[PDB]
Write a protein that binds this ligand. Structure first.
Ligand SMILES: NC(=O)c1ccc[n+]([C@@H]2O[C@H](COP(=O)([O-])OP(=O)(O)OC[C@H]3O[C@@H](n4cnc5c(N)ncnc54)[C@H](O)[C@@H]3O)[C@@H](O)[C@H]2O)c1
Ligand SMILES: NC(=O)c1ccc[n+]([C@@H]2O[C@H](COP(=O)([O-])OP(=O)(O)OC[C@H]3O[C@@H](n4cnc5c(N)ncnc54)[C@H](O)[C@@H]3O)[C@@H](O)[C@H]2O)c1
Ligand SMILES: [Fe+3]
Lengths: 869, 419, 200
């Protein structure tokens, strides 16, 4: 039963550990009942413990401890009784979160002599609500009391449905014993108290800790204060337990304006101002051996002077010494737990808090500070006192001894002894301790599918003869200044009068910018914003496709936000809503209506805008749904006179826009029927549009509509990896986009079409690799294989249809065959296989390629081979 | 000429709602109104969005006073509230009756001068409209959540309401009152009853079956209609029987119903929604149940290569309806190789009966709680007033009042529509 | 029961109401004590109903849309001169009320607030009381009559007999200590319009 040896300890802990494991399986009602019985047993025993605390400690006063043994039970209960601390605290079912709050284990309670019983009723009683255990290592001066404070708690818990040794205490303490308890393995936490050396040794143990320092507690009394209650509260805080209590106001800092008044008001109401010889004698007994006399602590005032060598009335509550030094040389400013007090003299407020912060900074860093002022009309002072004072508790118009243990003067403050002083003091709690610190929360995280979107430009218009019907719809009914962006071949050949012809004839002012060439550079973009910033357009228009529709919707940026650094605008990301350079909201200065005369790109719907740096020459595909065209237009009358090449490269980038959008990882049921309806039109009408041309406008139109439909697909289901390398392959060699996508898709499919790949994209919605299947759902949709095929022929037949399609469009079989030299390829292939993996298009490819696996399907194309793996 | 216009945002996955308000509402607005029905105010569905707004600097107000087949009395009631709270955003919720009522309150809030009769005016085209609707993005935006899987009102301009005086649902329409955002999360329909997952998920079958065949049908609004049809075939039965026990199906169907809205918002409905609206406001039959009884005949109606009339649309040169209804089956698998374009429809209609039998759908209107005396007496009314609905100005054979009644009756007596 | 509360509602409205007007939120204690007083008076007049000032006020503040408190501040300084007549025309016929004591109660009020000097005669304690109101109505922005309160002499005299007969028909007046005559109400309506007194 008794504990004065190191083995008795190692036995106790075990018969305790085994209580917890039996106590942890308890419910809320089975412990809500243990919590009361232990709190009553502690309240009804408020007087005796307070007697047993003075007989043994030699300090304190009875009637002021009784407010503590009682506060530590009633004011603890009213607060932590309804705190759900057993199981599920919260359950957000929209998400998949649940907080379950298992306990922590067992604890070591390091008790002081200052508050031996309250600090025990407080910990004992709070460690039962969290379904924990605890073991006390008390102070020799108060071992009999704080251990009689737990038996009065335990013997009332076991009587309420608890085990019989859940709690434990050391009877004959030491260092060899505590240091053997704090370092015990079956312990799981340390709940300490007692100032420096204590917390310096709690954390240093090896276990966690909620140790708690302590020290000075400056209090400031400004001109705009109620010097009456400022003083009573100063005395009601020192004399309370004779200041032995922590946080008590060891030092006031008054401003000259009201010092004399305060000086007297302290005198009449039991204040002896240490004027001369008395003072020195008093600041000589305080500090013994660099520390405060351990015999003066908690003792009444008149009992101070006797040790000093003088005498004062027995009714004196306090001993005040008017001083100026605010450093360590003055022992009259350290953490004297006596009723003594230091009275400083300051010019104004700012001169005080500068002085307070200086003497909290010496012994009481982080604990608490106080202020007395107009709590309602001087909120800036407050704001200036909280932002300047490095204390975890700033107590405005409250006494510290009864506001730091806070449920009396202020609510919303966690009632507690064991007041955290923040890392400033050497403890990482920063708050009044409670049961939510003795607790191991834990979070079950159900798989949540990542949110998706089908976002387009409103006002898509599509048929032959749709320009004037559209401009005169939403543009002219509205804006007044336009900026048509296009290329020369369209400005020269009357593709841009067909649009000004309509704006003119109404009130509008046009200005065309036609210095855009294939693969636009950032130099052309600036030059376009440099113009937009002069013409100040109310709207922006973009013709052709790709180069214009990619230079314009970015010129739309530099016009509304010229501070945009392309280096940050083209930063590769991992998710498009968790973007690190969130695009600015740009639809205010001007809109970005878009027209297209080129089939494939589909840029008229999608956020993508491919441009190159003009310094490194790397195409930086940059993406955000803020640069959607805002009323795209797609008229098939601007395509019927296209050459045979641009038709192929276009309609053949659209194929690889849907192919790697039906198979992508962001694919959905919204973007999977459009991709197919595109891929089914590019099969019935694409060859015709190449051979026949304008002679079959029915086909030249569908292809134009399809290539846009893919946009609806790959605007939401981003591209795959064929573009991540086609952008680099089409830059280091100036190969066109569509021609590059054609030389890879018949080797990229068979890359992604492995159900046992080396990697995978880590997308929640992506259960497992479906690409091999997601590619056969294509063939069966086109009509390649009806009868019961292996799912591997449906692919061979998909490729075959491509090699057949790439044949009847003049597409070469390889790059070598496309105007590239093995000497210039092998050299800068490792460079653009890395710069491909670092593209934003590849973050959606189902297989998450390895640099060592793009290089291979990048050589196998130069030599017209097949990636076999 | 044609178009394909929708909101500039359609967020859709289980758990998207907070991730559709934590994103956009609070980034732009601080005064929100919510429109719904009592079942959702009560059952804690509207405090799934007020939770996340109030947590921000937003002030909410909920107009929970909506009823099935909404009236113009409620609409004017919510405007008074909207005129008092002065919202920066409107958030419709509940599906259909609320959504169809909030986007019209949006009107009476932006422009209280309006007169409902000038909105319910049928027309020959949407551009060549006499009452050009006003611009509505200036006072408050309009969000649209949904809790049913059969309407598509999240995307479409259709806003069906009732005068409360004549009792005539006026399926008015204009893209100016499309929502700015549409949120379709299955978190809200997992616990939906069977009487709704059937009617709702079975109108959607029409939203898409008289949209892939309509004259305004385009390549844009044909793959979506189909994808809304290949999902309502593999997941609608399961979402009825298994219910929440197959949330993937109860989710895919929820997206399909919306995808069909991506279709019939661009390619208007045909004739089943004209006779439905009038046949479901008189006899107070629900929407989806009026569409499931007729669709299996309207097909037999529109699938006549030699009808009396076409709808006179340039893009529609020859009647192709008998063909489109075949590509449907050819896409769903009902079709066997070596057919003749006449059985693919039988194999299609066969898939519906098979689908209407396994959802609790009757075989006629008589079985649906309508007395032969209350029908034949007012059939010529809803047969002349269907012709006067805006939805029928898009179906491919411009029905005759001679020919509508005949299919009303053949759906009462469970008969077919031979000709 | 309802006499110490009424008074405590009156010793606080005298030491803290002026300060809560001028200083406003800069003296929240007064802006607080006054808030409690107003309620303590509710602890009184909930049990001991109002008199006649709230009858004429309600009718005089619904016709001319004058606020409640402003209709009560213009009249109270006369109703006192009315109820403080030891020999009125009528009493309110209440058993607990044997003799008219109103001229006396209004003195214990002053005697409690300090307005009274030792050696008075029960006739000045009321003057010293009314003097405290004017002094209090002048320092809150309260006018000296109804005319100054935005009411045209033509719109008043034309409908005075209405609100003078309809005040008598209010429930509040069935508790004041001298059962006013319609002859006597109008006279104090008008003397509050022309800022005059209510001699008799
Ligand atoms: N912030 C609070 O909650 C609070 C409350 C009351 C008192 N206090 C502070 O407590 C202190 C009271 O003085 P005390 O009574 O703590 O005297 P003290 O500071 O000597 O406390 C010594 C305690 O340390 C324990 N201990 C265990 N292992 C130790 C080790 N390795 N090295 C040193 N000590 C070890 C001893 O058992 C003993 O109880 C003051 O600083 C007072 O401000 C803080
Ligand atoms: N954002 C997207 O949606 C997306 C996706 C993939 C690729 N891209 C980018 O799109 C760009 C492709 O641009 P494009 O290839 O679409 O055209 P392009 O911009 O290369 O220029 C095509 C050239 O063909 C000629 N031309 C254009 N329209 C014509 C017409 N109607 N009749 C006759 N000649 C005509 C002009 O000389 C024009 O410069 C590449 O930079 C590619 O990376 C964009
Ligand atoms: Fe492309």
């Amino acid at each position: 039963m008794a504990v004065t040896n190191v083995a008795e300890l190692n036995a106790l802990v075990e018969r305790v550990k085994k209580a917890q494991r039996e106590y942890a399986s308890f419910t809320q009602e089975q412990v809500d009942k243990i919590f009361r019985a232990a709190a009553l047993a502690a309240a009804d025993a408020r007087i005796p413990l307070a007697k047993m605390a003075v007989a043994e400690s030699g300090m304190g006063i009875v009637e002021d401890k009784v407010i503590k043994n009682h506060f530590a039970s009633e004011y603890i209960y009213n607060a932590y009784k309804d705190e759900k601390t057993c199981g599920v605290l919260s359950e957000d079912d929209t998400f998949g979160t649940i907080t379950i709050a298992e306990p922590i284990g067992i604890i070591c309670g390091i008790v002081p002599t200052t508050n031996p019983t309250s600090t025990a009723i407080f910990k004992s009683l709070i460690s039962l609500k969290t379904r924990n255990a605890i073991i006390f290592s008390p102070h020799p001066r108060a071992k009999d009391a704080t251990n009689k404070a737990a038996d009065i708690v335990l013997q009332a818990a076991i009587a309420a449905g608890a085990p019989k040794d859940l709690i434990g205490w050391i009877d004959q303490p030491s260092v060899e014993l505590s240091n053997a308890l704090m370092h015990h393995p079956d312990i799981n936490l340390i709940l300490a108290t007692g100032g420096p050396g204590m917390v310096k040794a709690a954390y240093s143990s090896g276990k966690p800790a909620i140790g708690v320092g302590a020290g000075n507690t400056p209090v400031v009394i400004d001109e705009t204060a109620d010097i009456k209650r400022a003083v009573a509260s100063v005395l009601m805080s020192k004399t309370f337990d004779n200041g032995v209590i922590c946080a008590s106001e060891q030092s006031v800092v008054v401003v000259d304006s009201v010092y004399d008044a305060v000086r007297e008001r302290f005198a009449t109401h039991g204040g002896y101002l240490l004027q001369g010889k008395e003072l020195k004698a008093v600041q000589d007994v305080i500090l013994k051996n660099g520390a405060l006399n351990a015999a003066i602590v908690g003792q009444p005032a008149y009992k101070i002077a006797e040790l000093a060598g003088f005498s004062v009335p027995e009714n004196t509550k306090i001993l005040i010494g008017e001083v100026t030094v605010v450093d360590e040389s003055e022992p009259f400013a350290h953490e004297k737990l006596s009723p003594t007090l230091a009275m400083y003299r300051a010019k104004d407020f700012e001169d005080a808090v500068e002085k307070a912060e200086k003497l909290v900074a010496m012994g009481g860093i982080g604990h608490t500070s106080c202020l007395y002022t107009d709590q309602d009309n001087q909120p800036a002072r407050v704001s200036y006192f909280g932002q300047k004072m490095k204390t975890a508790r700033i107590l405005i118009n409250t006494p510290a001894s009864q506001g730091g243990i806070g449920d009396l003067y202020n609510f919303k403050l966690a009632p507690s002894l064991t007041l955290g002083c923040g890392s400033w003091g050497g403890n990482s709690i920063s708050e009044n301790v409670g049961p939510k610190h003795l607790i191991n929360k834990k979070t079950v995280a159900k798989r949540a599918e990542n949110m998706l979107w089908h976002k387009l430009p409103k006002s898509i218009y599509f048929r032959r003869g749709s320009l004037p019907i559209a401009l005169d719809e939403v543009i002219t009914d509205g804006h007044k200044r336009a900026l048509i962006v296009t290329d020369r071949f369209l400005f020269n050949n009357g593709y841009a009068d067909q649009i000004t012809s309509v704006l003119k004839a109404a009130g509008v002012e046009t200005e065309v910018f036609f210095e855009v060439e294939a693969d636009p550079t950032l130099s052309i973009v600036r030059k376009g914003a440099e113009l937009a910033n002069s013409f100040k357009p109310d709207v922006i228009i973009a013709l052709g496709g790709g180069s214009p529709m990619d230079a314009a919707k970015i010129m739309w940026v530099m016009y509304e936000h010229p501070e945009t650094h392309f280096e940050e605008l083209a930063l590769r990301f991992m998710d498009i809503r968790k973007r690190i350079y969130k695009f600015p909201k740009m639809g205010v200065k001007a809109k970005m209506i878009a027209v297209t005369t080129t089939s494939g790109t589909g840029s008229e719907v999608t956020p993508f805008a491919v441009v190159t740096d003009d310094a490194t020459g790397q195409k930086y595909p940059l993406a955000d749904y803020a640069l959607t065209p805002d009323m795209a237009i797609v008229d098939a009358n601007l395509v019927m006179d296209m050459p045979k090449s641009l038709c192929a490269f276009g309609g053949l980038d659209a194929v690889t826009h849907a192919m790697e959008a039906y198979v992508s990882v962001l694919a959905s049921e919204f973007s999977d029927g459009q991709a197919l309806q595109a891929l089914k039109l590019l099969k019935e009408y694409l060859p015709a549009s190449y051979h026949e041309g304008s002679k079959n406008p029915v086909a030249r139109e569908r292809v134009h509509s399809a290539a846009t439909i893919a946009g609806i697909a790959f605007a939401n289901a981003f591209l795959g990896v064929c573009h991540s390398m086609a952008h680099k392959l089409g830059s280091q060699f100036h190969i066109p986009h569509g021609l590059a996508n054609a030389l890879l898709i018949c080797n990229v499919i068979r890359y992604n079409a492995n159900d046992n790949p080396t990697k995978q994209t880590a997308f929640s919605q992506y259960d497992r690799p479906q690409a091999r299947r997601r590619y056969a759902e294509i063939a069966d949709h086109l009509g390649l294989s009806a009868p019961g095929d292996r799912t591997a022929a449906k692919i061979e037949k998909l490729l075959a249809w491509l090699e057949t399609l790439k044949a009847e469009l003049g597409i070469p079989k390889s790059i070598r065959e496309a105007g590239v030299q093995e000497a210039d390829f092998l050299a800068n292939v490792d460079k653009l296989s890395e710069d491909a993996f670092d593209d934003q298009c590849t973050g959606a490819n189902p297989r998450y390629p390895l640099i060592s696996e793009l290089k291979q399907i990048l050589l196998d194309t130069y030599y017209g081979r097949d990636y076999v793996e």
